[PDB]
């Protein structure tokens, strides 16, 4: 299944800024709901499950002048671990949910 609108996507990633590993790990997100760094999601669009790729995200498609460093290019190494369609609850909440059932709201 390909990454696209309303897919819940699991990625393994390493984030580098100016050659220094800032953060790495694995996370799942609901695609197409502005829940990721904008440039990263754009780079993930249309990727197949199992794909490994690098993405350069300029500050303007991320944190801009403020940063969170200013004007940094984010250097992502990404693995698309899993792609699935969202549940109705995920779509109405606008975010991905853990696999275990637990009815809730926010």
């Amino acid at each position: 299944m390909k990454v696209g609108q309303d897919k819940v996507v699991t990625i393994r990633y390493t984030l580098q800024v100016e050659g220094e590993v800032l953060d790495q790990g694995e996370l799942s997100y609901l695609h197409g709901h502005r829940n990721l760094i904008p440039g990263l999601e754009e780079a993930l669009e249309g990727r197949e499950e199992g794909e490994a790729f690098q993405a350069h995200v300029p500050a303007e498609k991320a944190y801009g002048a403020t940063g969170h460093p200013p004007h940094a290019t984010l250097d992502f190494q990404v693995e698309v671990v899993k792609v699935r369609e969202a549940t109705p609850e995920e779509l109405l909440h606008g975010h991905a949910h853990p696999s275990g059932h637990h009815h809730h709201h926010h």
Binding site: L15, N35, I37
Partner: peptide, 6 residues
């Protein structure tokens, strides 16, 4: 949480 903000 910089990749997927809280």
């Amino acid at each position: 949480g910089i990749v997927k903000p809280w």
